[PDB]
Amino acid sequence: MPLHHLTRFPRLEFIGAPTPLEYLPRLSDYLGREIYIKRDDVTPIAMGGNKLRKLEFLVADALREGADTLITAGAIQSNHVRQTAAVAAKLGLHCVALLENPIGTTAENYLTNGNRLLLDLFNTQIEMCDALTDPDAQLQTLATRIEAQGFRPYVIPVGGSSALGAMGYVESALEIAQQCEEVVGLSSVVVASGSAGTHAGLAVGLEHLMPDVELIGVTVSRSVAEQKPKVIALQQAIAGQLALTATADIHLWDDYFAPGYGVPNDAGMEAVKLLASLEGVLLDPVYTGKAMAGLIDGISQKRFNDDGPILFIHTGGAPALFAYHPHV
Amino acid sequence: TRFPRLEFIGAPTPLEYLPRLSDYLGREIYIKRDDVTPIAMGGNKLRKLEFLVADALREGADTLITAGAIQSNHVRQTAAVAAKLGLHCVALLENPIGTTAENYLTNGNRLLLDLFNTQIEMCDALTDPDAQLQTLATRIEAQGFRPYVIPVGGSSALGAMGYVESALEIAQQCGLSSVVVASGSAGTHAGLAVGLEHLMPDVELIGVTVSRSVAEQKPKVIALQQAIAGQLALTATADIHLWDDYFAPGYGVPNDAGMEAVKLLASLEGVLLDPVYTGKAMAGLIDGISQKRFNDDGPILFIHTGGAPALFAYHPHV
Ligand SMILES: [Cl-]
């Protein structure tokens, strides 16, 4: 009932059915606590991912605006850029990508394999830059040039994280609440917290459908201090677009991303190895592996509110496994 | 329905209209998205494993053994399933193409095998898969384990039941004139053969071969077709159609027509095919239009059997 204004936003149909919400009996056995998993990694478009949920709203907005070109930005190994390019091809829209090498690697699989390989399969126009120091400003300059060629560009921010994009995860929260109804009482939810639209959309939805559930974001690029205002700003903007208040505090753990965004760490790689070997589930070195490492240590250090069921949001990211191998 | 089966997929996989590709080819093309399954990046082999692994549990196995190329999709899917169910996995692998390219040897499906904690046994060649798997099962059994052997490509009568099931989904989900599928170890072809004869008999089913000529491959598809039919107490009289022009110079080697099929589907539809199987099968479908090989001019159904992780293994070359 309280999420009905969500209906007013046009959206494309990229996913179809709700994504699986599954129990992880072997991980749970190992961790000594019930772990469930929301499989947003399993979507029908170009190897899937959370970003596709945001693109349903973003691209429908682009179509409504008469745009014929999608322009966005990210790392060379961005999942968002890859999903945006797959969607662009499918719809006969052009796609322009402003890419950066965030970790300064020269490893060939990072530079040419994984998500970056797929971009060429999608005929993505690639614009390289030294660094995304000011993505909104750099994306505009790029739009101006694209426009001078006669294209009608729609600019999507980094990670698809705008209030509109984040509606996709307000929607995901609705699925989660329905799937858990009379099946399991969730105590905590864990998701990776990057550009912040996924966290923020979950925050609004869960506040209204599942107010007792504790939502934890595991940062993948930022400290709590840098990250929290970004999540909050989106949270509030989302709530307003829906004519809702959002009074929930935002929780973030920043202990699991060192040495930095896009750099693998030992605990993140152990997390990937653990989910693959115990559950046949594929995480990634950049996002989900670090988030899972966060979940695992949280159980270990008693960081959660209690001993009840945890839901891990699988946001995707697996194509990056191939780019990060063998190293850097 | 007599055969016990594990639920790895659940919902029917999507069946879609490809309007951009259709527009380009001047023909109606549909796709069966069996590449979209929830387990370890998906694929057709998963449909087979629903039956083979159910069979394995019934016999109280604790270890699954199968064989394939280093970049085998089946082995990767078997290993993920094994990991999920708490079974050991032993894989017999060969290098079918004599490559030393780092990505073929260590990336793609092969990388996933390590993540899934697969035990790896290398052999010069899978000249006698049935017998080599048998030897492996013995040495594994003599170590205190209880092995269950899964054939190459998961292709046996039991395995192929997975594709009688897909045929039902196709029937439910569908003026279809033709169906195109890659024909390798043959369980998929033969499973769709049985299911489609009994549900869509007017539909022409074409297997595009990926490893063999029509002469070498037809008996394999037939043997399996007849076996599947017997097990379901049916008779299958429909003949097997195969095109073998699209796989040169051999199994697991990409060709230009297949790679350009991957490019066309990526750029037109945002769909990802692979260099070994579906790309080649799609090139056959396209050339089937070019040379008017199909029975008529009506809608074509392409079966996306999967294979995409091999894109990362085959890049940049060899
Ligand atoms: Cl334990």
Numbering used by the authors:
A (entry chain A): 1 to 328
B (entry chain B): 7 to 180, 185 to 328
Quote from the publication.
D-cysteine (D-Cys) moieties are found in firefly luciferin, semisynthetic cephalosporin MT141 and malformin A. D-cysteine desulfhydrase (DCyD) is suggested to take part in the catabolic degradation of D-Cys and D-Cys-containing toxic compounds. The polypeptide fold of StDCyD is similar to those of other fold type II PLP-dependent enzymes and consists of a small domain (residues 48–161) and a large domain (residues 1–47 and 162–328).
Structures of two distinct crystal forms of recombinant StDCyD were determined by the molecular replacement method. Apart from the unliganded forms, structures of nine enzyme-ligand complexes have also been determined in crystal form I. In all the eleven structures of form I, besides the hexa-histidine tag, six residues at the N-terminus in chains B and C did not have well-defined electron density and hence have not been included in the final model. All the residues of A and D chains were in good electron density. In the form I structure, there are two dimers (AB and CD) and in form II structure, there are four dimers (AB, CD, EF and GH) in the asymmetric unit that are similar to the dimeric organization found in other fold type II PLP-dependent enzymes. Electron density map of unliganded StDCyD revealed a significant patch of density with tetrahedral geometry at the active site that could be interpreted as a sulphate (in form I crystal structure) or a phosphate (in form II crystal structure). These ions could be refined to reasonable B factors that were close to those of the surrounding atoms. PLP is bound by a Schiff base linkage to Lys51. The PLP phosphate is held by hydrogen bonding with main chain nitrogen atoms of residues Gly194, Ser195, Ala196, Gly197 and Thr198.
